[PDB]
Each structure stands twice: as C-alpha cells, then as structure tokens.
Design a protein around this ligand. Structure first.
Ligand SMILES: NC(=O)[C@H]1CCCN(C(=O)C(F)(F)c2cnsc2Cl)C1
Ligand SMILES: [Zn+2]
Length: 139
C-alpha cells in the first residue's frame, strides 16, 4: 500500500484504488497501473522533473529503504494477475531489489523529489510506475 499526495491530488496504484478514489476520479490509465483522485486537503509531496536513474525506495515487506539503479521508463511485459490479463505495462522502470505484492505503493525518490511508486516485482526485481512526465500534478 501507499500513495503520493501533491496539491489537491492523491496518486495510487490503479489496482489498489478504493471506492472513494473512483468517486473522486481525475485520471486513470490501466496500461500504467495508475489512478489519480482529488482531495480536500493540500498535499506537500514534491514531484521530481529529471532524468535520474538512481534513487531510494521504501520496501514495506522489510520496513526498510533501499538504494536502486533503474531503467528508463518503458513498455514491459507483465504476467496475468487477478487484476489484469497478461499485457505490456507502459512507463515502467525496473531495478534489482526485493519486492512482494503488498509493497505496491512504496515511493521511489531521487534528490529532486518523488519519481514513482512500486507497481510490479518478483525474483529479486522491483518495478516502478513513473510519475515524472505528469506535469499537471503541479500546474
Ligand atoms: N502492475 C501490475 O500489473 C501488478 C498487479 C499486482 C500483481 N503484480 C505483481 O507484480 C505482484 F504483485 F504480483 C508482485 C510479485 N512480487 S512483487 C510484486 Cl509487486 C503486477
Ligand atoms: Zn532526480
């Protein structure tokens, strides 16, 4: 679990969105596993606007943060799950690091701010849904 709170927006994994997120929907994209909903309170998270390929992510299944080197956002084949059929997920960044299903939503950050959230994993890999291209989160 986990979300990004920036301005009047809440960014979560689309497969973990609640009834309230869908009732306050701003934008969603199944191909990216992202959903954004509106909030009444102001969020103070900062979104990175950079091309960093290193950062630190939070791993809830270890209660620890880990440093990572990750690939540029790209289209990656993801196996079928109870939430989606087998498909290419876009804007996904892979890295070597521990992750379990409940780790989805953990933030990846670089020195410039929030880069994305955990969205896939397995066998010593961790994949992050990028949010740096969503310029409207601030403007
Ligand atoms: N973005 C997706 O399609 C997710 C949906 C939930 C299931 N997906 C996963 O990768 C996983 F949860 F099974 C997993 C396994 N080990 S670490 C993680 Cl994260 C794909
Ligand atoms: Zn950066």
């Amino acid at each position: 679990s986990g979300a990004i709170y920036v301005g009047n927006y809440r960014v979560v994994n689309r497969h973990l969105a609640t009834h309230n997120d869908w009732a306050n929907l701003v934008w969603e994209d199944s191909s990216r596993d992202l959903l954004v909903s509106s909030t009444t309170a102001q969020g103070c998270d900062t979104i990175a606007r950079c091309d960093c390929q290193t950062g630190v992510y939070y791993c809830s299944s270890r209660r620890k943060h880990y440093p990572v080197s990750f690939s540029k956002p790209s289209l990656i084949f993801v196996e079928a799950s109870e939430y989606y059929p087998a498909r290419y997920q876009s804007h996904l960044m892979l890295a070597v690091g521990h992750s379990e299903p409940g780790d989805c939503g953990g933030i990846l950050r670089c020195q410039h701010g929030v880069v994305g959230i955990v969205s896939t994993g397995g066998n010593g890999l961790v994949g992050f849904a990028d949010v740096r291209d969503l310029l409207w989160l601030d403007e």
